[model samples]
Target: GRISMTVKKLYFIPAGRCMLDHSSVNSALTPGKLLNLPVWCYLLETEEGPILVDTGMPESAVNNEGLFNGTFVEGQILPKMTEEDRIVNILKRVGYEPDDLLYIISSHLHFDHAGGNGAFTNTPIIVQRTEYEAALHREEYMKECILPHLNYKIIEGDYEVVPGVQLLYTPGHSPGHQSLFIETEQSGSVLLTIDASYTKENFEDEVPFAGFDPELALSSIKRLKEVVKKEKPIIFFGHDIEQEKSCRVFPEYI
Candidate 1:
């Protein structure tokens, strides 16, 4: 039996950028050169479940540097945000607590996406096998990305998290990275391209990112574009803030 779920855009966290050249990885070029880049963590509420796409920054990152900060790729780095801007605090303000989260889905195990995994201690943090393995073996892997607090539930099979959300494995930015396809009544279906594309222009041009597996990344994009053509769903660029919120879901009308 399928259940209808409602996803809501809950919060956004602003982190600085390191690169802003298309030649850079993960559309780093879009935010890299900017004086202030807004790296975001989007919270979605579903009738069948509550899911968070990314975890944003950790408390220790207020002054961290190099990979921990935006310097790993040379991001300009936005000003430090407060602890209150933390995901937990953001949830609290909206009347939900951190512990209430049912699951956290990550696009990649980068510090930007997995940094605050510790806050949701009891929640099930869903990740791809490759990403988890990379975190374990790669010394340069996001050390704090996969925090110990959240219980790890490595996804072994490609399946739906809820009735309307689809987890599509599109590894490239990082091995085992995945993107989300969310279907909505208003927009029909939309692909949440976590790193598949960073800006609206990137998606429009169907750009190939540097350092990423061009072949595989292109395949993923082609598949998603066909999905949009066949299904007529919206494509939500990962870092596109041109939209009111970075979080992209089909608006409810049904």
Candidate 2:
């Protein structure tokens, strides 16, 4: 006998945008070009409950530049955010509430990904033990974001969120980065490769990035490509402009 379950739909939540330099995204890319990539969060409404993956940035960091200090936000990156882009607001738009979320799984605890964590204090946040340890001690920004909401169910290696959804330990971008695989009736198999691959271009072209372990990052990408070839799931790139445009947002679940 086997347990049967169904994930009704997957929602793409547009949290905000992050400005980056071309070189940062791809080493062999344009030296001075600028890129403004969309920041996204995923919502899976299953037969059992609703599960969220990544929480974009907090509303306070939207236009408030002071919170991020003059260093990270000054010359490094520009975060574009609106009041409506908050995670709570996005949930409400989809006819859900903070309390309705059964679990919030973080791909990694970067500033943009875990910024909105404060909004779901009561919800159980799932993260790999490796990543959780890194966030709490290594990264100061991530530490600040995670400290507020402390109900984290840390696990090691690959773990199943539900029967059809699994968190793949893809690391590289950070210490313990993970990607999501959700099998559903309507959408078939959907693979949400958060930061494992930043954009469709990076994933397709096998581009290498800086700011982390380059070799590990490349390995992670290769693993993702292998999975894609095998499973044939719909790929959701981390912050691709074209993908975001095509994805269904709030009020339109797929």
Best by TM-score: 2
Off by over 4 Å in 2: 65-69
What pairs collide in candidate 2? none
To one decimal, what is the Cα RMSD in angstroms of model 2 from the true structure?
2.0
Residue-level lDDT of model 2, residues 184-203, one tens digit each, is: 77878888988888878778
Candidate 1: C-alpha RMSD after superposition: 4.3
Find the 10 residues in a row with the least total lDDT in model 2: 65-74
RMSD for all candidates, in order, please: 4.3, 2.0
Model 2, position 40: C-alpha lDDT score: 87
- What's the lDDT for residue 119 in model 1? 80
Q: Write model 1 residue lDDT over 162-201, tens digit each, in one string.
A: 7677788877667777888776544556666777666665
**Clash count, one per candidate:** 12, 0
